[PDB]
Amino acid sequence: MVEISALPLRDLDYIKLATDQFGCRFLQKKLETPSESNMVRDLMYEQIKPFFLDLILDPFGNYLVQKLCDYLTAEQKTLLIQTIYPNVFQISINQYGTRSLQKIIDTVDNEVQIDLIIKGFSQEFTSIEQVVTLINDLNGNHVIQKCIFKFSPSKFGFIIDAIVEQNNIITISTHKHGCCVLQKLLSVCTLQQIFKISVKIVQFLPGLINDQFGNYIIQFLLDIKELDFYLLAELFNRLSNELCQLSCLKFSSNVVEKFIKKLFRIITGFIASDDVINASMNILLTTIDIFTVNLNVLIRDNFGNYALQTLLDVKNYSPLFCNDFSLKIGNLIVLTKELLPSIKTTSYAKKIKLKVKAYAEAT
RNA sequence: UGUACUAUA
């Protein structure tokens, strides 16, 4: 390597170097110098044109591509992407290739480069089942997320299609990495894109409602205000009959709890559309009803009690149709504190005692 | 008394 330093830049084997760890670490540190920078890449770039794909997937070549991304001309980077865009799948799913593609995305210079990458993710080159596979893959999901954060939501077509296709909403949402990807997508999606996916989520709701990851998807939606006129009715018109069961499961409890708190925030906040507010008021009383009925179960239940304490939490509904609320709540609380000795040993025995004591001093 | 955050020298 010391002798290569002596050799003029014209006569270096950049592929042989880049394939080598120490040989690659050498080439990087050269790019990190204004003296010997333009001369380096312009000879590197010329020698590697037919080998971009190789370098991207090479256990040591990828570090050079990433490094070269910070010094490439738009004219030169556009040509790299023109060469490897059909291969974005096998690149993204690769242990070494995922890193290269993320840097290319994070360093795009124009619409043309972006479109090419998008073009390679289209069904012309990459299938739906493969997109789904990328979303859930340990190396692939990092590439999708970069697309999600770097690209305008108008390019999200290939991702959206893979989600709304059949029952894939279970494949993605009920999966470690895929659950995180979907939330990232929904965090920057357009209003239309949120609705298009939200419909599908509603369709397969019973499978997402108590999944160890899917439940985070429902709660995520419950924070989007622009969904109140639709999601609020749909959850209740699909889950109200088993609300007792839903409150006594490890994951669904948290969605019910998130749900109850949303009804409070909307109603108290008014003191949002009147219909939404109105509909929230009927559901809440209907919510309270079921809990009053199943008190002798929910308060003794390992997960149910948490949902119960949330419904009773005066802090949530202190500013409090309002006539019937106090009767439903009163009846609920007035025979709840009648059950404290029935769970004397329990951890949360004295937790509710301070709650019923907080309702008396607010009424 | 109760749930997730990742992968190349």
Numbering used by the authors: 202 to 472, 486 to 534, 557 to 599
From the manuscript:
PUF proteins are exemplary mRNA regulators. Puf5p is a broad regulator of RNAs in S. cerevisiae, binding to >1,000 RNA targets, constituting ∼16% of the transcriptome. The protein scaffold comprises eight α-helical repeats flanked by a short N-terminal sequence and a C-terminal helix (R8′). To understand how Puf5p accommodates a wide range of target site lengths, we determined crystal structures of the Puf5p RNA-binding domain bound to RNAs of 9–12 nt, including the recognition sequences in SMX2 (9 nt, 2.35-Å resolution), MFA2 (10 nt, 2.15-Å resolution), AAT2 (11 nt, 2.5-Å resolution) and AMN1 (12 nt, 2.8-Å resolution) mRNAs (sites of 8 nt did not crystallize).
Puf5p binds to the 9-nt SMX2 RNA site by recognizing all but the central fifth base. Bases 1–4 and 6–9 are each recognized by a PUF repeat. However, the fifth base, C5, lies in an atypical conformation, in which the plane of the base is parallel to the axis of the protein, within van der Waals bonding distance of the side chain of Cys381 in repeat 5. The ribose rings of C5 and U6 adopt C2′-endo conformations to accommodate positioning base C5. We refer to this conformation as ‘5-parallel'. Repeat 5 also lacks a large side chain capable of stacking with RNA bases and lies opposite several of the atypical RNA conformations (5-parallel, 5-stacked and triple-stacked). Recognition of the 5′-UGUA and 3′-UA elements by repeats 5–8 and 1–2, respectively, are identical in all structures.
